[PDB]
Amino acid sequence: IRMAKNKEFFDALEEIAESAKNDETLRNELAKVLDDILKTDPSDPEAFRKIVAEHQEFWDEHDPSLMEFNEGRFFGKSRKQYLKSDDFLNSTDPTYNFQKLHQFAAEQRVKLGLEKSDTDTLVAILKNNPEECRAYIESKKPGLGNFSEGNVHGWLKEEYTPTIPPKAINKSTGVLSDEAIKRIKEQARDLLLLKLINSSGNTQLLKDLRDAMSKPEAERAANALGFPTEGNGVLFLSREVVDALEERVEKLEQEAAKRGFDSYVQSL
């Protein structure tokens, strides 16, 4: 058991995002909830408790436990009072405080937008370094969130690395940490691999990836499938990608057997 609902809201954001993977209506609803959280100053605990509680209708549709107020404990407190206390959302939480919830929300908002993003954006996430990634995410507004000054609290002014042309960089590590960018790249990796797998008809190449026994072997196959070498640093085969690989090879082999049979059954 944990004090207050802080951790439950963390896990709820992830699990609702999961349920939104193929539910476009829920995606838009969750995007608005995340957008509202991100525009709120997490060092203003009253404004932050208020923006979370203001979406009670949304939270109730997914887990009534988040907004549940058992008047058995906290008996001297009304519901309106509880929703403003640390017993609802603990601002001094050692682990899941409002700053961490804000930072988590920024990462989820990007991943939410990545889900249906095109190939080129997945590749851009893998090719850009973390500073470049933050600026690129701003460039995609609002597809990956409204990451811009005044619309996400603490988002910094865009800077530039003096190449020709200047490359946009953003140093808002207090909003999207380097570790959040790393997990964003891991999700982009999986999303892109799944696209390349579905588009490929090269059964042997897909088998080479499916049967890879080491990272160099996986790199050679994935790169031949179109995965960018700039993503090799984060290349790791996850459960979902392995499962897609097995099913795709099986489908291609069934289809190949149905044709090789017919090219023979009416031939002779």
Residue numbers in the entry: 7 to 274
What does the paper say about this structure?
The effector RidL binds the Vps29 retromer subunit, blocks retrograde vesicle trafficking, and promotes intracellular bacterial replication. Here, we show that the 29-kDa N-terminal domain of RidL (RidL2–281) adopts a “foot-like” fold comprising a protruding hydrophobic β-hairpin, which determines the interaction with the Vps29 retromer subunit and displaces the regulator TBC1D5 from the retromer. Thus, the hydrophobic β-hairpin of RidL is critical for binding of the L. pneumophila effector to the Vps29 retromer subunit and displacement of the regulator TBC1D5.
Using this approach, we obtained well-diffracting crystals of the N-terminal 29 kDa fragment (aa 2–281) belonging to space group I422 with one molecule in the asymmetric unit. The structure of RidL2–281 was solved at 1.9-Å resolution. The electron densities allowed for building a model comprising residues 7–274. The structure features a “foot-like” fold, consisting primarily of interacting bundles of α-helices connected by loops of various lengths. The surface representation of B-factors indicates an increasing flexibility from the heel to the toes of the foot. The β-hairpin is structurally well defined and rigid, as well as hydrophobic (based on surface charge distribution). The β-hairpin and in particular the sequence motif PTIPP at its tip is conserved among L. pneumophila RidL homologs. The three prolines in this motif break the antiparallel β-strands and stiffen the tip of the loop. Thereby, the side chain of the conserved Ile170 forms an exposed hydrophobic spot.
